Structure 1
């Protein structure tokens, strides 16, 4: 992988849509580095403030950017986070917003043990297409794509289509 130009990919969308499942499988099958922003924030304790209503530490956005910037500059990173408005626009060559039918997403999040308030917040987030709109506001239209993420066959199609995009991008950028 040394001395190859490699792309960076954002996987975004409501909690429960399948970002981590897709990201880890993509990294295994491409050799690109997988980064879970929530896990990274946990491991490196990148928090500032506590959110009273949602009951969780608040992500320190500047510190996350500082933590990751050098790696992103070097390329070949798949980043997984529900949001995207604070990332430098230059980081990503393509952005995928995974989408899940509300009925399907609810069962996933219920299985996680989310309580009523948290289930409702996330379910509304998806039905209002909040994170899709956040992606389109933050990145060029042409590099933002919605991916269906309801069934295992769709996960496989998503993996296949992205692996193929990665191969073409690498060819196009290592003439």
Structure 2
């Protein structure tokens, strides 16, 4: 991949929709680097404060941006997070909001062992389309796309679609 301009891709959407599954498959099949923002914050200890209601450390957004910026500038990164308003807009060439039917999503999150309050907050996040609205508010409409993420066939279609998009973008930006 030396001396090829490569795109950056954001995968966002409610926890449980399938971002990590899709991102890891995309990385394996494209050679792009996959970054799980939650995992990165854990590894590099990028937290500031604790949230009383949700019972979780608060992500230090400025430090996450600082941690990633050099790599993002170099391109070829697939970023996975359930938030997107704090990323520099320039980072991403395309943004995918994964969507899961509420009934399907509930079953996924219930199996994670989420308690009632956490289940309800996450499920309302999806049914209010919070991440979709956050994405459209943060990035140009023409680069934001919703992807269905309910069934294995849809995962396969998503992988296929995005891999094809990567190939075209590379062709267009390495004349």
Instruction: Give the TM-score band, short-chain normalised.
Output: over 0.9
Question: Per the alignment, in what secondary structure is the counterpart of residue 97 of structure 1?
Answer: strand
Show CA shifts across 1:103-148 (max 9, x none). 0000000000000000000000000000000000000000000000
1:161 is displaced (CA, Å) by 0.1
Aligned equivalents of 2:52, 2:68: Cα separation in 1 = 27
Give a deviation string over 1:53-83, Cα, whole Å, max 9, x none.
0000000000000000000000000000011
CA deviation after TM superposition for structure 1 residue 171, in Å: 0.1
Cα deviation digits, residues 25-80 of structure 1 (max 9, x gap): 00000000000000000000000000000000000000000000000000000000
Which consecutive unaligned segments of at least 5 residues does structure 1 have?
Answer: none
TM-score (norm 2): 1.00
Rounded Cα–Cα distance in structure 2 between residues aligned with 1:145 and 1:5? 22
For the residues of structure 1 that align with 2:15 and 2:77, how far apart are their CA atoms? 20
Note the C-alpha offset of 1:159: 0.0
Q: 1:151: how far off?
A: 0.1
Aligned length: 175
- Consecutive unaligned residues in structure 2, runs of 5 or more: none
Q: What's the C-alpha RMSD, in Å, of the aligned pairs?
A: 0.2
- After TM superposition, which residue ranges in structure 1, 4 or more long, deviate above 6 angstroms? none
